[PDB]
Amino acid sequence: LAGLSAALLRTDSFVGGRWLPAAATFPVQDPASGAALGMVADCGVREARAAVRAAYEAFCRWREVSAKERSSLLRKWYNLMIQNKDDLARIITAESGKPLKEAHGEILYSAFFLEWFSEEARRVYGDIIHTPAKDRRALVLKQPIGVAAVITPWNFPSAMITRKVGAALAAGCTVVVKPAEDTPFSALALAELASQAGIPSGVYNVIPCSRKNAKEVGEAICTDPLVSKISFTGSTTTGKILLHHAANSVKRVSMELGGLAPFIVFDSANVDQAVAGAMASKFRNTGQTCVCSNQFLVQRGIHDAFVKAFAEAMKKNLRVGNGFEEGTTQGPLINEKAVEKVEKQVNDAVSKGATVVTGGKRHQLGKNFFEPTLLCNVTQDMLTFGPLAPVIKFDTEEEAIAIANAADVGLAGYFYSQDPAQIWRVAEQLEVGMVGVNEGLISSVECPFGGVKQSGLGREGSKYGIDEYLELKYVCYGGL
Amino acid sequence: LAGLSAALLRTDSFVGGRWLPAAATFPVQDPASGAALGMVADCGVREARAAVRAAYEAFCRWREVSAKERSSLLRKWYNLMIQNKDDLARIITAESGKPLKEAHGEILYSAFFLEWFSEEARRVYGDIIHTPAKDRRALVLKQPIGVAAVITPWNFPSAMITRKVGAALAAGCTVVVKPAEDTPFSALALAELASQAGIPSGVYNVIPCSRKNAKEVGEAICTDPLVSKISFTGSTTTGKILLHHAANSVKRVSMELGGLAPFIVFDSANVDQAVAGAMASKFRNTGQTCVCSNQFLVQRGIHDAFVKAFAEAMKKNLRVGNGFEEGTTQGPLINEKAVEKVEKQVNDAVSKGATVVTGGKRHQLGKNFFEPTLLCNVTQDMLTFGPLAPVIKFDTEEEAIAIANAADVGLAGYFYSQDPAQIWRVAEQLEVGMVGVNEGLISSVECPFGGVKQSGLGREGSKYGIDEYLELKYVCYGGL
Amino acid sequence: LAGLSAALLRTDSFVGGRWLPAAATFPVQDPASGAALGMVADCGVREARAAVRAAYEAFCRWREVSAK
Amino acid sequence: NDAVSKGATVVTGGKRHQLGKNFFEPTLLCNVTQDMLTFGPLAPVIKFDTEEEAIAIANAADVGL
């Protein structure tokens, strides 16, 4: 378990440049062994109106540094993460529960976000438009929005914080961060690394707080008028509420909420590969991701040939156990109510027609452990973040889409199909934000992550992400 | 008055391709002579849930036409406007009240928006990002958001409808339009022109409705789940409310609300030019614009030399009268409550220290007519859409900004200054969305109009505007 | 007063086999001298629905061991 | 601000100090007419004529520290 560097670990929220303990604390436990992991500062509103300050003030000056300078700091940070992967990793596995590998997996995917944005910071380009009138010359500068509120989910305690903040600070903004108390350490560990990197005090803050204040602080930072922006990743409910708090102050916003994820396997689709992505998508982090390939849609032809081939691969390598435990594939789910979200679905399926193919009951380790599962004959009248993938048989491509596009969900969808033509049609008509072609993992710091229709606003990462933190200022230069 | 082509004029809301009369109507009158201008269809919610339909369905097919095709239609439309300027003009003067010239002024600035976007429609570019992994190729397409709700103010009954819808349809979207019942005809006149141009039924709709239903229909279209987008221009209050309706359905949004407008005149500033822009900015449409240079800030040095020079120019050419009346500079304000918004301010200024320099009482035509006015010694403790420009003396550039940047207003600000250096500093520190340099009119279809901090979301027009109607779809092409 | 073995003494509630500190604590004092005796973990309901679990699960197996 | 805004020729400082937070640059104002009456490093000057008046105002009752 322990053994990490006392520095990478933290418990006192980090505001304005220095650590600051909360009036009262809240406990964090390894969602696997149950072992307590010290008390974390539980930030109450009074702190936000104070964190949002030292965040603001830090801006009034950070907005000044040469883009080259901020690109320098970021890099210097991206480094400190890289030079700490193995410790920054444990921090995740320990609080997320997820296998150690997936931890490094996250840790890199995190640093790599600081890295990239570090580069983007030096390329915010204004324009020089030509206009009729001979006497006036038009100009367009892009400038930082100012303070930015950042709330992050628990499943990616580092990558979810890095991808937003990297850009945020790339465009010269200041950020106040309320991580998920499930995994708040990775948020503070960054903080430590950022300070060492030399980030000017108040540019990057963290304010841990448990449920009790998650609602309060919520509006606290999403209302405080010094916050001109809000970036959030989470459940549809919470999101819609923050809007309601941002509306009141016409703030800038970008959210990526939940959203099922259709994984359409066609006949021209190669099975071993289709069963490839299939596994890596609905079993990574133990199927606890927004981009968790929810319901698999398979074409009668290759249907049975799929499941058999699919389930067989599961047994072959899905080793349920501890995160830091060698040779481990699945890990804990978060917490009790979670194993119940799976449990539920699993029974309402069996009970309503679902020939279970593998597993089905809580694993024999209990607690927050569940044995992965596969069902079929799963008629759509049964639609959950858990290591559970249900198969649905279909006939036409039109129908396969027809169902997948069962509107009001536009996060990420995947499909396998050897027909060059069918690729384009499916992939374009797919009302989503990210399509994985003959691949099951589509993560990448250089691409635009986000959803469509109610699955979110704005994107994160890529040449396109840093815009979430700029405002355009047209400047009509006249008198010529 | 009358004499126009029966076609350019309309009264039955236009939905799905064909005219449709409202259960009950509401009257529209020339805010100048009072003369009634027929009853317009007063659309009630039941119609919206029906307009939002035929708007949706029109999309499911418009999303298909070749960008070249839609660029063709738009142009064909831009033409029909151009070939109708003189009639499309009267329609505005008659319902807006504003001088006939300013009408043509608008009418062109309108068509020119269709024109431009007609071009943009053929240039929506996807990207091809390079990524590590040899086996997968990343792609990024941009696609239409679908249906779009459009509400427009009264002061620009045509340009405000054209600039949004042009883009909207450029990116292949469908629009439902609720114009300001003050000036709803220009919205229908377009409609007529659009049909003639050949716009597929339901791509562009108009649904007049007076106050009585403005609240209802409001959410009607801003909630109806077929509306995936909302574009609005108006008062801060109304806006914040729509958000509250869009939040509930995480819709895409872009708003440009009110916002004072600082017009900073420095010493290096040429007076005749400073008094130039000064006039054209706070007296166009009779100072009834969002981008209406609200409070003039002048540097002691050139202060007195300004006002004298300023007021003198007013008397010289500000001919108050009827809109269609030859040699007319000012026109009516909208309506009674409006002349009261001016009246108010004017007295709370005189009464609290404001040496009136010209005019001050309702004009001797009464009704919705007011004689322009100029005051000074106007201490900031008195801060209104009316032909009234108050002068405020200042010392330092820092202060001039200090005041102008009196936060929570970021629409458009103007300043005159012959110092090359001072231009850059002022113009960049100016927390706004559009800065007019040594010029008082900064209108242009090719540039980005919109504000910052609470004065709005997103921009309209320019290579940057058509984005308000696209969603990015990353597509990780794998299996290679 | 003090001098006892650090082990025999405790302050973090004991659930499922291992110690677990409470979100917030409550003080315990010698009802005689008044001298404070450290803060004890103050278990809140959320813990019970969790203690009653690891208690249950422990049963499903303890019900098995030989009475001997 | 309610002073400057209502007639108060600032003589020194007036905005939060350039250290921000809970720091403020001391200040001095004048022409400060009594219609503006605070524990902070801020001293406003009020011009008067008679000793009677000087008391008259100072003794603006319900304050005797």
Curated annotation (Swiss-Prot), chain D:
NAD(+) binds at residues 38-39. Changing residue 13 to D: In SSADHD; <1% of activity. It is found in: Mitochondrion. The modification N6-acetyllysine is found at residue 15. Belongs to the aldehyde dehydrogenase family. It is linked to Succinic semialdehyde dehydrogenase deficiency: A rare inborn error of 4-aminobutyric acid (GABA) metabolism, which leads to accumulation of 4-hydroxybutyric acid in physiologic fluids of patients. The disease is clinically characterized by developmental delay, hypotonia, intellectual disability, ataxia, seizures, hyperkinetic behavior, aggression, and sleep disturbances. Homotetramer. This is Succinate-semialdehyde dehydrogenase, mitochondrial. It comes from Homo sapiens (Human).
